[PDB]
Paper text:
Viruses from the family Picornaviridae form non-enveloped icosahedral virions that are about 30 nm in diameter. The capsid proteins VP1, VP2, VP3, and VP4 originating from a single polyprotein form a protomer, the basic building block of the icosahedral capsid. The entire capsid consists of 60 such protomers, arranged in 12 pentamer units. Here we show that the exit of the RNA from the particles of echoviruses 18 and 30 requires capsid opening and results in a loss of up to three adjacent capsid protein pentamers.
Asymmetric reconstruction combined with 3D classification identified subpopulations of echovirus 18 particles that lacked up to three pentamers of capsid protein protomers. We call the particles lacking one or several pentamers open particles. The missing pentamers always formed a single compact opening through the capsid. The absence of one pentamer of capsid protein protomers creates a 120 Å-diameter pore in the capsid. The openings formed by the removal of one or more pentamers are sufficiently large to allow release of the viral RNA, even if the genome contains double-stranded RNA segments. Reconstructions of the open particles missing one, two, or three pentamers with imposed five-fold, two-fold, and three-fold symmetries, respectively, were determined to resolutions of 3.8, 4.1, and 3.7 Å, which allowed their molecular structures to be built. Except for the missing pentamers, the open particles are similar in structure to that of the activated echovirus 18 particle: increased diameter relative to the native virus, reduced inter-pentamer contacts, absence of VP4 subunits, and holes along icosahedral two-fold symmetry axes. The capsid proteins next to the missing pentamers are more mobile than the rest of the capsid, as indicated by the three times higher temperature factors than the remainder of the capsid. Residues 1–42 from the N termini of VP1 subunits, which were previously shown to interact with membranes and facilitate enterovirus genome delivery into the cytoplasm, are not resolved in the electron density map, indicating that their structures differ among particles.
Author numbering:
A (entry chain Q): 2013 to 2026, 2030 to 2043, 2048 to 2257
B (entry chain R), C (entry chain U): 3001 to 3073, 3078 to 3175, 3187 to 3233
D (entry chain a): 3001 to 3060
E (entry chain P), F (entry chain S): 1043 to 1122, 1132 to 1275
Write the structure that this text describes.
Amino acid sequence: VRSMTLGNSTITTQNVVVGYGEWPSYLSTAEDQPTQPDVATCRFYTLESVQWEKTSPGWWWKFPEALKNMGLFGQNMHYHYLGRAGYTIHVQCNASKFHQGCLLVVCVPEAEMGCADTDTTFPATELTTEDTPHVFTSDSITGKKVQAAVCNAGMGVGVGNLTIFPHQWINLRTNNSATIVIPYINSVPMDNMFRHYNFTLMIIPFAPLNFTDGATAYVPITVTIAPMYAEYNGLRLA
Amino acid sequence: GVPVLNTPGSNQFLTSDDYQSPSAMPQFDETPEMHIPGEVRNLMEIAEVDSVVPVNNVTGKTKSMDAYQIPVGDKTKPIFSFQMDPGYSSVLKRTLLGEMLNYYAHWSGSVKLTFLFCGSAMATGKLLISYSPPGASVPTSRKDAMLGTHIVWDIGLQSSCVLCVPWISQSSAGYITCWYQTNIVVPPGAPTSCDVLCFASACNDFSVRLLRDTPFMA
Amino acid sequence: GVPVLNTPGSNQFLTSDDYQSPSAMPQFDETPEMHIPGEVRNLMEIAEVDSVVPVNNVTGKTKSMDAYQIPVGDKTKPIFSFQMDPGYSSVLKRTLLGEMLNYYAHWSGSVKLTFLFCGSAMATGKLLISYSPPGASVPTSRKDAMLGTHIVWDIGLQSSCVLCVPWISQSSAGYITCWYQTNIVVPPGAPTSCDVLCFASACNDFSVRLLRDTPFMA
Amino acid sequence: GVPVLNTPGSNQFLTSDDYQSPSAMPQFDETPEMHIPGEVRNLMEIAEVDSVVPVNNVTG
Amino acid sequence: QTRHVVNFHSRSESTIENFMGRAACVFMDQYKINGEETSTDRFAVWTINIREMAQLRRKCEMFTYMRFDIEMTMVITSCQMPVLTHQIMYVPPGGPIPAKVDGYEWQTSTNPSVFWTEGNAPPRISIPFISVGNAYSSFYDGWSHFTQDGTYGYTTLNAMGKLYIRHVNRSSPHQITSTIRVYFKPKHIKAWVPRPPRLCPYINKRDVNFVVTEITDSRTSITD
Amino acid sequence: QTRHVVNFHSRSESTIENFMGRAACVFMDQYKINGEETSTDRFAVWTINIREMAQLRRKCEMFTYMRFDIEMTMVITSCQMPVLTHQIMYVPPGGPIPAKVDGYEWQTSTNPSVFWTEGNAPPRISIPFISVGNAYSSFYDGWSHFTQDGTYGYTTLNAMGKLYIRHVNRSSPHQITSTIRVYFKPKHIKAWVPRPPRLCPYINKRDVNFVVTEITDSRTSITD
C-alpha cells in the first residue's frame, strides 16, 4: 500500500505499464518558446466512478479534452492553443473477494471511430461528453452517432487483438488496480487540445462480472488521471 | 566517350527494383525527424504481443464478446479444442499472430498460449491441458489425454498457465484440448460458472519468408 | 564494352534535375567577375530589412501615403488593430517580410515590430501596445488589454518601441492592438495631431521551406 | 553527365551471355543451404563410374 | 500440399521496408487528346493518398505514424499519327491546379513535371517527405476546424499533393485515348505506434466507417 | 486547414540558387514544314530575355544585378510521314540572323545548333555568361544613345542572344505543324543589390510603365 500524493491530491494505491517504454518528457528556440506550468496541473483528477454491472459492454474516454473542465488543466486549455502532457492513468476497481471478472484497460492513441450508419458523419458531441464516458453497445446500432458495438470497438478492428497498445488486465481474481503512462504520442511536437484527441482510454470487460444474490449488483471503476510534464506555448513577447 | 552496350533488360520497368529515382524536388529540404515513441522496426514485433483468442466462436457468438470467453462450470467431453496453426484455423486466424502470418506464404516457429482464469478468487479446481503432436489423433477421453503431453493446471494456486507449442509451420497440425480434472469447487458466496480467456503470440522467435497478399480483403 | 542497362527514367525530361548540361560555347571564356557591392546570398536577407507597414489601409486611403500613417490625437476604442500573420493579412502581406513569404508554403519564425512616433519633440503621452496570443480573443477594453501582455510606451522619453512577436507560422493568429493610456499632452506652440509609423521584419532568424508561385501576379 | 556511346551489340539479346539479371524478388531471402550428401561438381565424375556394358546386344 | 520441415531462421522479409516498400498500381484513368476544348476528360487528377485501394490501405493501417519518400513510375499506353509526348505534373500541397487542359497552371515553374515521349522507358518521378509535421498520420482522431466543427478525421498534415497528367500534343487528326497506371511505392519508410489489423470491410475512401463484422468464422461447437 | 506547430530551422530553400534556378516554360511557338517558300511562319525566333512572362520577371526584379549561366531544354512536338529532325540554332548577341527558312545564316559555323531527331530525349543546350559587363542588369536607368536620345531603359549589356528553330527536312507530302516549348533555367546564379518587389501589374515587355495601384487591400476601419 503506497499513498501517492501530487500537489493537493492524495490517492491510495496497491506494476506500471509504461506506454511504449518511454516516460513522458519536456520538448527539449527563441522563435517559439514553451511555458511549463508544473504548478498544479500535475495533481490527480479523479473522474466520476463508473458502476460495472453484469450487462456493461464497456466505456471510453477521449483525452486530452476529457479534462476540459478539470481545474487548472481544463482552464489552461482555454488560454493556450498548443500543449502536450503525459497522463498517468490509475484505474482501480475495489470489488469484493466473491466478485469475478476481467477488464482490458487500453489507451489506443489516435482512435478514429466510425459512424453508426455510414455515408454520413456524427455531430461531434457523440465522441465525447467531457467527464462522463460514452458506453459501448452489445450489438449494432443506427443513427448519427459512433458505431459503439464491441467486437469492433470503434475503429473496425477486432476487439480481442486490441492488446497491441499500452494495456493492462484487471483480473478481479488477482489484482484490482491498473496504471498506464502515455508519453504524448503525436506527429507534431505540440497540438491544439480541443481539435485533436491524442488517445482514447477505453475499458472493455472481456469476462463479464458475475456474483450471487447477496453481493452488490455492481463494481465501481475509479479512473484517475495525472497530467505529467504538461507544457504550453508562450504568451509573452520576445 | 565510354563504349557501353545495353544488355537485355534495358529500358524495361521491373516492378521490384531498387534504383536511384531522380528526385523531383532537389532544392526541397525535408522536415527534421523528431523522436516519436513506439517505433516498429520489424513486423514480428507485432506477432510477439499477446492478444485474446476467440475460442468460443460458435455459430451465434461471434459478433459479441462471448467469442473470447471459455465457459467453465459433464466431465466426459472436453471444455474446448482447436487446431494449432495460425493459418487456415478459425480460432487463430484473426489473432495478431495469425494476422501478421497471412501476409506470408512460408513461416515457421513456435507459439505460446496463456490461459487466464477469470473466475472468482475463491473458486478452486483443476484443468488438464493436453497437447497432441501434429501427426497424432485427438484424445477421446481424459485418461488418454493424461497419457500424452499435459499440464494439470491447478486454478486455486496459479491463475495463468503458459504453454509453448513448437513445430508450427506451413508452406494436419497439433491440438490444445482442455479437460475437467476436477470440477470448480466454490464457497456458498461466490458464483458457480466462470470463464477462461486465452492468449497467443510468438514464443521465442518466429521465422517467416515469402510475402503475399492477404486473403481477407476482397 | 561496359554492360549497362537503362533504368526506368531514362530518356525522360524531369523539369527539376541538376545534370551536367553540354555547353554550347566551350571555347568561349566568360568575363571575369568583379566585386559589385551588395551581394545577396540568401532570400531571408531581404525579410530582415525593416519596411513601413500600411496599418491605415482603410477603403479610401490606400493609393496615397496616408496608408502608412496611424493618426494619434475617444479613449474607449483602440487606435489600431490587425492580424499578426504576414500571409493572408491585408496589413502585412505587401511588406518585404510579407512579400518574400508568399513565395513559400511552409514558413515559421518570429517577427519584430518598430513603432516610430513621428510627432513633435514637445508632444508627450502614453500608448499601451497589447499582444494577444494566437488562440485568445481581442481585448474589448483598455483594462482587459492591460491584464494581458502589454508595454506602456511612454512617448515623451523614447520615440521608438520595438516588439518581437513569436509563434508566427502557417502551412487564427495574434493581435497587435494599441490603446490610449493617456492623451497626447502638447504645449501651446506644437500641433495637436501626430502620426505613428510602423515597421516589420524578421526578429532573429526565420524558417521557410516550400517554394511556390506567388498569388499576386495574374 | 558521363558521355557514353553505344557500341554495335547494344539492345540485343545474345542467348549466351552472363550479365547481371535484375532480381524480381529483392526483399526475398532464400532458404539456407544444408549439406546434402553426394554433390556433383563436374560431369566427368559420372564418366569415372564403372557400369555394365551390353556386349551381347544381338538382334533378339 | 504436405507439411514439410520448414527449417530456416530469417526475419529480413518482416522488416518495415521489406513489407511496405512494394510498388502497387493505385490509379488507372483515361484521358483524350482532342475535342471538347472545355472538358474535364482530357487530363487526370488523382490526389495522392494512401487510402486508394484496400489492399495497401490495410498495410498502412498497421501503424499509426509513418514517414517515407514516394517514388512512383507511370505506365502510359495509347489507343485510337505522330509520336506522342505526355506530361505528368506533380503539384505540391501548396500549389495551383489546372481547370482545363489549356490552363496556365501547367506552365508553373514550382510544379515539377516530366515530359515523357512514347516508346522509351516509363517515366519515374520521386517525391520526398512533404508533410508539415514529423510523420504522416494514418489515423487522426480530431477535427480539422476548431471547436468541433465538420470534417472529422481529416488532418492537413498528411497531404501529399496531386498528379495532373495530360498530352502535350495540341491536337490530332483522329481520337487518341491514353491510359495511365500510376505505380506508387513507399521508400525509406519508418513507422511508429503499431496498431491492430483491420477486421471489417472498408466503406468509403475518406473515413473509417464500417459495418459490425463477426470476429472469426464460426464453428459448430467449442470442442470440435 | 489548421495552425500546426511548424517546428524546423532551415533556410536552404531561401538561397538565390534555390529560388531562381527553376525551369519554367517561356516560349511556345508554331512552325510549319512546307509551303510558302518565302514565309516567316516556318521558323521560330524568341530573342532571349528575362522579361518573358511576369511570374519569372517578378523574381528577376528582386535584384538589380545578377549573373548566371542559362541551360534551356526544348520540348518539341508535332501534328499533321518520315522521322523528323529539328534544328535549334542559338545565335550569340553578335550574330547573323536568318530571314527565311532557307537562308545561308543557318550554315554559320559560329552559331551553335543542335540537331534533335524525334523520339529521343529532349535537346539541351547550355549558354554561359555572355554579357560584356560583369552582370546582367534587370533595371537600367539610362539612355542607349548618348545625349538623352530615344530608347530609355534599354542597355546592350543584358543581351543574351536569339534562338532560331526549324525543321531540317526540306519538304513533306502533307502539312506538319511542330510546337516547341523552351524551358529556361538560370544556373550558377549570383545576385547583387536587392530591390523591393513589384507592386503594380506589368504593361509591356520592354518597359517599366505601370498604372498607379493601391498599396494593400483595403479594410473597413483602422481597428477591425
